[PDB]
Amino acid sequence: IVGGRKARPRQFPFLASIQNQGRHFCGGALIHARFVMTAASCFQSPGVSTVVLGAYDLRRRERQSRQTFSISSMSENGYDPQQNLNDLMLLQLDREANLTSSVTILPLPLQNATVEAGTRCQVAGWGSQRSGGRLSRFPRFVNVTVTPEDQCRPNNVCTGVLTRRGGICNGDGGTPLVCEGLAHGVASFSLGPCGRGPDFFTRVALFRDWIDGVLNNPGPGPA
Ligand SMILES: *[C@@H]1O[C@H](CO)[C@@H](O)[C@H](O)[C@H]1NC(C)=O
Ligand SMILES: *[C@@H]1O[C@H](CO)[C@@H](O)[C@H](O)[C@H]1NC(C)=O
Structure with missing residues (x-):
């Protein structure tokens, strides 16, 4: 993370x-x-x-x-x-x-439910803080935001941080994206340097x- x-x-x-x-x-x-x-x-x-x-x-x-x-x-x-x-x-x-x-x-959303762009979520994990860097021994978490669809793909839910660097990194794969108390996503991948964005999560619903x-x-x- x-x-x-x-x-x-x-x-x-x-x-x-x-x-x-x-x-x-x-x-x-x-x-x-x-x-x-x-x-x-x-x-x-x-x-x-x-x-x-x-x-x-x-x-x-x-x-x-x-x-x-x-x-x-x-x-x-x-x-x-x-x-x-x-x-x-x-x-x-x-x-x-x-x-x-x-x-x-952790509870699941109903079939086909959606979360709108701009919605605030959380993600936590023991992943690294930098591409190819070492894992974190303690879990870490970050507040993230749902991006607009156009920035994402239908199969996924994408997020970003208003700040700079934020998001998933090595070791955060499969970790959940939680919005409004439900598992709306599964960490999938992200393009280029960790923190860049946006991050791609499988759309659980x-x-x-x-x-x-x-x-x-x-x-x-x-x-
Ligand atoms: C969910 O959506 C798909 C495509 O929009 C549809 O074909 C299916 O009927 C939907 N399922 C329910 C449970 O709404
Ligand atoms: C997450 O967001 C809450 C609400 O804005 C905030 O008060 C808290 O500092 C944030 N924590 C981090 C890890 O982003």
Whole structure:
């Protein structure tokens, strides 16, 4: 996260940390006790990662706070790598997370809901503060603004900071964009230097139904 402030413990309790060999590579959100919503793009270079909930300081063990999980199944709906279309993915946890003061669910918008340009949102994560720089051990967050459609693409929700540098950076992939208390976006990509803008998030409301379907039909799938 660029241009942000350090978060307090349990300030974004729905946040997730996707790690590989203990190395954080993407963020995500708990949207249901058994699933975490993230970015399909996070999965290119698979499920031999872990999902960490309730973390704060990436360097500590915070045993009394964290819950760790394996990924039983991955669900994508038309992800297109080439264009980065439909960059959204659902991970099913090996087991049901427990809901504590440090681990909660972030609600979803209704199918097709919209957010207008100029709307104020928040984004948090452990990503770096500079292109190719080092991750942040504490989560950080920044106030962002929804841009005009013309600045974005239909599949996404785009944002910017009134200020200078602000936005997502390395490690912020799949982290959620939260507007009016709901997960309106999933961090996808951004062009050029972190902080420049605008930032591209998958438009969550377009997938509500498909998501519900997944939630309602759990289980690895065809074999
Ligand atoms: C959402 O919008 C699409 C395209 O505008 C439409 O075809 C579909 O009927 C809509 N779904 C509902 C739940 O409004
Ligand atoms: C976010 O916005 C609120 C409301 O304007 C503000 O008072 C607060 O300082 C901001 N925090 C940062 C991290 O932008």
